[PDB]
Amino acid sequence: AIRKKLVIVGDGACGKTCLLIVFSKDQFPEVYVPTVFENYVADIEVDGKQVELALWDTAGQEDYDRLRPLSYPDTDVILMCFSIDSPDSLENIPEKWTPEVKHFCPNVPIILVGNKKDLRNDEHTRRELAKMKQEPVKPEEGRDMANRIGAFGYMECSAKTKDGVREVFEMATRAALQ
Amino acid sequence: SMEMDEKDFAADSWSLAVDSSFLQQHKKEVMKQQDVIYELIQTELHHVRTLKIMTRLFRTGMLEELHLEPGVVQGLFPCVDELSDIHTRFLSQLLERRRQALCPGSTRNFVIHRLGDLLISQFSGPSAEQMCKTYSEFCSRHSKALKLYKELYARDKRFQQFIRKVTRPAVLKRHGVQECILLVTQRITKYPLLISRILQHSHGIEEERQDLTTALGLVKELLSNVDEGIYQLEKGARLQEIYN
Ligand SMILES: Cc1nnc(N2CCCCC2)s1
Ligand SMILES: Cc1nnc(N2CCCCC2)s1
Ligand SMILES: Cc1nnc(N2CCCCC2)s1
Ligand SMILES: Cc1nnc(N2CCCCC2)s1
């Protein structure tokens, strides 16, 4: 099996930690959801190819501009996350995260991932956002941002229901192999 | 790690570590606070274990089996002995706090009510200055260590056989040389996330809410100082490149 490295980036409330936990855990966390993620090496078989995919989180490093880039050496694929319940997390993608990742990870494929897709049809979420003249991120807004930043592709998932989670990591493995 | 501590921290949470008849005696808020304190101690035990893999398995193994040029092992594992001393002492204090809190006749039922004071002590005074100095040096030497590793693995057969041998066991799957270095660099930025979540469930005793608020502030000051003191060293960098 070939070894590849994945790093997830995005704003503090984007759901990156929860996404790594749900993908990596054997059973869904029904008793306690961890605060942090250390690392993990997933055994993935995608399109007949076996890969050892090392997973890393940048949670906690968002305010530390000299510590954060130490997570990037030899990254093979970037998952760039935003939360669908946070239109503001999507706005920081082209201004901050994209130039940073392109600088430290040249030529590395970026998959733009819209997290918490289950909140798009959540009445409490829609009520809260409507007070700030906002609404949950639309699928076309996610695709357009991904197209604009030169992302390898656009994907959505929900860590809460697990929908789309396996597909995200299988596609990230395919991107890392190209 | 030692068997006693591994078994004490084998469960996924504090609520699954204690007896169910003990869990039932506590309010939901106490359980939520204890689950996050348990995660802080469990991840500290794992972090000390990562440092022991670096010092005992890799570093010492290379000195005892390989003929590496002097100053090479130090370049691969900068500050590992100092980091091991800092975190083994901190882990010792966390485990002693848990041990004193055990109910008589039990080796698993406890509640830690006073963590804030231990965190203020760890992240203030000489121990905080030592953490700041050690992480500023470690994180500035991180890129150099990774490049030195890559060079040795690609050009030295005996080094490659040594790495493939000592990393073959399934328990070392997440702990190759480069993985250990990033695990250590990332440890310090996990602390505010854990402390903030403990604080969110520690409002019941005002002295405790105040102590954890002070500790969170000290941890953030340490991180800001380490972040400001980092500049990546590069092997063979010239003075002109540095002062420009
Ligand atoms: C929510 C929950 N928090 N703690 C729980 N325990 C009692 C039932 C068995 C698992 C441990 S459930
Ligand atoms: C933290 C970061 N340090 N440098 C960054 N770059 C953004 C793109 C242009 C070059 C500089 S981000
Ligand atoms: C792991 C998990 N990620 N999301 C979860 N949901 C249930 C609890 C509250 C937030 C939404 S569990
Ligand atoms: C699962 C999780 N539930 N709450 C978390 N916190 C992260 C640190 C700040 C306080 C909130 S993580």
Q: Residue A9: which CATH number?
A: 3.40.50.300
Resolution in A: 1.6
Find residue A83's DSSP bridge partners.
A115
Question: Which ligand 1 atom sits closest to the C-alpha of B16?
Answer: 11
Q: How many separate domains does chain B show? A: 1
Take residue A154 and report the two structure tokens written for it. Answer: 């656009």
Find residue A51's DSSP bridge partners.
A2, A44
Listed residue (A15, A11, A65, A68) closest to A37, CA to CA: A15
**CA B166, CA B180: separation in Å to the nearest integer?**
14
What are the chain A neighbours of B192 within 8 Å (beta carbons)?
Answer: 60
Take residue B81 and report the two structure tokens written for it. Answer: 């002995």
Q: Experimental technique used?
A: X-ray
- Please provide residue B129's backbone torsions phi and psi, each rounded to the nearest 5 degrees: -65, -40
Give, using CA atoms, the residue closest to atom 12 of ligand 4: A35
Cβ-Cβ contacts under 8 Å for B129 (sequence gap 6 or more): none
- From A8's Cα to the closest Cα of chain B, the distance in A is 14
Find residue A3's DSSP bridge partners.
A52
Cite the annotated binding site of A by residue number: 10-17, 28-35, 57-61, 115-118, 158-160
Q: Which of A61, A92, A96, A100 to mutate to test the pocket of ligand 2 (most atoms within 8 A of CB)?
A: A100
Cβ-Cβ contacts under 8 Å for B27 (sequence gap 6 or more): none
Take residue B230 and report the two structure tokens written for it. Answer: 């980092």
Q: How many separate domains does chain A show? A: 1
Find residue A43's DSSP bridge partners.
A52
**CA A158, CA A72: separation in Å to the nearest integer?**
25
Backbone dihedral region for residue A74 (phi beyond 0: left; psi -120 to 50: alpha; all else: beta) = left
The range of the structural domain enclosing residue A130 comes to 3-177
CA distances from B74 to B54, B80, B176, B182, B190 (A): 11, 9, 17, 17, 26
Whether ligand 4 lies within 6 angstroms of the CB of B200 is answered as yes
The range of the structural domain enclosing residue B168 comes to 1-244
- From A40's Cα to the closest Cα of chain B, the distance in A is 6
Q: Does A64 lie at the interface with B, CB-CB under 8 angstroms?
A: yes
**CA A78, CA A12: separation in Å to the nearest integer?**
16
Q: How many CB atoms lie within 10 A of CB B93?
A: 14
Let me know: does B114 contact B82? Beta carbons within 8 Å: no
Q: Does A28 lie at the interface with B, CB-CB under 8 angstroms?
A: no
